[PDB]
């Protein structure tokens, strides 16, 4: 055994040097009277033995170890023996002599580090790294952001570079060490996006022949030069609609604001660049502000004032005040643009029309469309079939054809009404096990529940199943009319005059519905009668189901496939110093509704009955997003009366402006064809729809708040003169567009304040930017807090240092009681003419808890519910 | 439309021969999107489910067709059922 001295030399391993060292430390804390002590000597030689033994235990016949490796094991032996005073003075003294070595080494230091790395160009030529341009992009990137250190990033980058780096991976190196900093300061996310933009500018501009490279503020003059170059190459490759050349590109080139690139989060820019920016040969040649300008232009190709409206639409989009739906963003400004990709259908009870509906499913899904299918009219197991002289097997064998079409065309949701004789088989279609002939693992399902069924649940009544072919009028009836006609058929079956039927207990079927929702996630629960009694289009059709995402309530028939034309307001951009900017909200809603009305005319239609319904009724669906983040800005916890109040009044405000905007389009473009007879014609607004719903169903089964903070009487008058759209509002999921704009999803509570993305190199944690901002004000943002958040997967509950006001404000989806989410949705639904996609989160998971929850959802006048997220751990 | 015809012609026990050779094979470009075709078998699955639901159908494929090897195994008793059509000849 030998030891590597501090500097090179090798010497034999001598226990004495260890024994002397430890003895020095004992004699330092004690006096000299400890010099001759059997105790010290016995202790030291014991510590020296277990140290020397440790080196023997890990190695065979001799070896070599570092001098510091021995010092560490000496401290270990002293420490494990509980020698606190001797161990710490050993550490202190040892560190004092390390300081003298470190300092003396720095005094004798010589400086060589030079020159610089040579950046390799694409053509293969070497070039010295530009330090001036490197400082420019990182400074313009840290511009306007707090607690960001540009010099810190430049130093950490400069480390991981080698002679012969390419300018390609010099930017990625800047990005790599920029997102590693978002964990301790979220504002680096903006810095990370601004650095990545440098690659995009070089990529796009170099492709367009404008410039081989450029900085941010250099875009103040280059965005106008790049736009006409972009349109010319875009149309050349048939990636952009040639009609866009009819715009005044010089005027639009000046309207572009290059500073809005600074708004992007890293995730938002990645999203657009990966999937939305136009490209050729893998090269993205569409820059972000030109992307927003393309969408604006595509939405204005038929406006009288092309440029003025295009600028109005570009300003709304590029500022993140509002964001068009995913299909609009992707296809606006391109040939035959699919601007809407959400449809509702109803399937007729004949074989030709069944397979006509299968055919429509395939065509509508050819470009990623989502579908709701009303299958209630199709006759159930045991029904007679003339011509065949046999008996039907019901809807499920046809749903299997639907299921395999969805697989073949690359989602769809089937709806069935609760008295349908196939309902029991329907509830089990998504079980993991069992007969596969009775499963549709690639198709969604939803219950179309009449009020009467829930009434029978509340009252422990019975419930009769029928085949629709024996009761063909029930599906189209609703409200009192349905309940009278249904009880007539019920009495008929009890007197043997309607053979094909099944009597069950309503509570038993209800329990089966909730257990399948819990076990399989399906079928979802949607309510037929509020969707129909509150539909503004009752005079010209019937709502036969909702859509794939359960927020749309539009009529369907033989000649009408309803189309959802969607967009969402960004509530975050309408919160100022803690308050809702009522004034700015009206301006954004007015422009949003116009853009959505334009979508109807520009949209390219594949099936004629989808064009027919859109042109006849002109429904749109204006939603919201950033609700949870808007609560943060007001310091309102989602589980409070104050959040329920904000949800009520914010929807009432948007609703007023949205309805008012539709009146303005009616003055300019004329009311939609079927306006005459609609609820709007009768002066029955959504707030009035709630009142009549309570009258119809009865206060015994529904209770909803009816408060109002605005004056609707003047608007209730102007609406009767005409509006442009049969439906205005719908709150849909906003997965992509919330990520693009950097806000929370629609109305969802935060699912978790922390997530650990891991998809390239290492894993990068992302923490709720609002949570960290509040923890700074309290002075509670530090390394230990970060280590606690990871341990608790982002939950601020049960960490002592956070005060209770923040534990409540940053409660996660599974630690907010479900009643808050339902009551909030209930008050938003008072002002929405369609519905809202409502995910529910339930910890504890019991059939009892599901019962009280979905009874409450119905009792509070909700039209739809969506996914159930259930945990049985609590 | 061809699948619609199958259901209508089978409505009263009729028998069918379907030529599927013109439908493009796995890997073919589709200008509908910018993706690749998964071949004829995913549509034959719809034919299979239609024979079952309307209950008789024989699908034909030419020997140079690039999906032929999957086609040859559609009636094996074992294996991935998404690559099988047990109710279709
Ligand atoms: N022969 C050896 N075998 C094993 N460990 C040794 C040996 N010599 C020294 N050590 C260990 C024990 C102590 O922790 C430390 C000795 O410190 P010290 O006696 O000051 O020697 P050193 O390497 O620092 O040289 P110096 O005489 O300049 O102090 O290193
Ligand atoms: N006065 C003291 N108090 C505490 N520990 C001591 C004292 N004197 C010696 N020791 C311990 C810790 C040291 O590692 C070791 C003494 O060796 P020493 O050579 O003086 O220090 P060192 O090896 O860490 O640095 P260097 O040799 O470079 O001066 O024994
Ligand atoms: N061969 C079959 N296999 C399975 N289901 C069938 C078959 N033929 C008919 N059906 C089902 C599909 C529809 O739900 C229902 C009605 O079929 P359809 O073709 O419309 O007859 P029909 O409408 O001309 O006469 P009717 O409705 O008066 O009995 O029967
Ligand atoms: Mg020493």
Coordinates of C-alpha atoms and ligand atoms in Angstrom, one line a residue, chain A residues 5-6 17-18 20-29 67-68 71 74-75 86-98 100-101, ligand 2:
Chain A
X5 CA 1.2 12.7 -1.9
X6 CA -0.3 16.2 -2.5
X17 CA 1.1 9.4 10.1
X18 CA -2.6 8.7 10.7
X20 CA 0.0 11.2 14.7
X21 CA -2.6 13.3 12.8
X22 CA -5.6 12.2 15.0
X23 CA -3.5 12.6 18.2
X24 CA -2.7 16.2 17.2
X25 CA -6.5 16.9 17.0
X26 CA -7.2 15.4 20.4
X27 CA -4.3 17.4 22.0
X28 CA -5.6 20.6 20.4
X29 CA -9.1 20.5 21.9
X67 CA -3.9 11.8 0.5
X68 CA -7.3 13.6 0.6
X71 CA -8.2 12.7 5.3
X74 CA -10.1 10.0 9.1
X75 CA -12.9 12.5 9.5
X86 CA -12.4 16.7 17.9
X87 CA -13.9 16.0 14.5
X88 CA -15.0 19.6 13.9
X89 CA -11.6 21.0 14.9
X90 CA -10.0 18.4 12.6
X91 CA -12.2 19.7 9.8
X92 CA -11.5 23.4 10.6
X93 CA -7.7 23.0 10.8
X94 CA -7.6 20.8 7.7
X95 CA -9.6 23.5 5.8
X96 CA -7.4 26.3 7.1
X97 CA -4.4 24.5 5.6
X98 CA -6.3 23.9 2.4
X100 CA -3.3 28.4 2.4
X101 CA -2.5 25.9 -0.3
Ligands
LIG2 N1 -4.1 22.1 15.9 C1 -4.8 21.2 15.3 N2 -6.2 21.2 15.4 C2 -6.9 20.3 14.8 N3 -6.5 19.3 14.0 C3 -5.1 19.3 13.8 C4 -4.3 20.2 14.4 N4 -3.0 19.9 14.1 C5 -3.1 18.9 13.3 N5 -4.4 18.5 13.1 C6 -4.9 17.4 12.2 C7 -5.6 17.9 10.9 C8 -4.5 17.9 9.9 O1 -4.9 17.3 8.7 C9 -3.3 17.1 10.5 C10 -2.0 17.8 10.7 O2 -1.2 17.8 9.6 P1 -0.7 19.2 9.0 O3 0.5 18.8 8.0 O4 -0.3 20.2 9.9 O5 -2.0 19.6 8.1 P2 -2.4 19.3 6.6 O6 -1.8 18.0 6.2 O7 -3.9 19.3 6.5 O8 -1.7 20.5 5.8 P3 -0.2 20.9 5.4 O9 0.6 19.7 5.6 O10 -0.3 21.3 4.0 O11 0.1 22.1 6.2 O12 -3.8 16.6 11.8

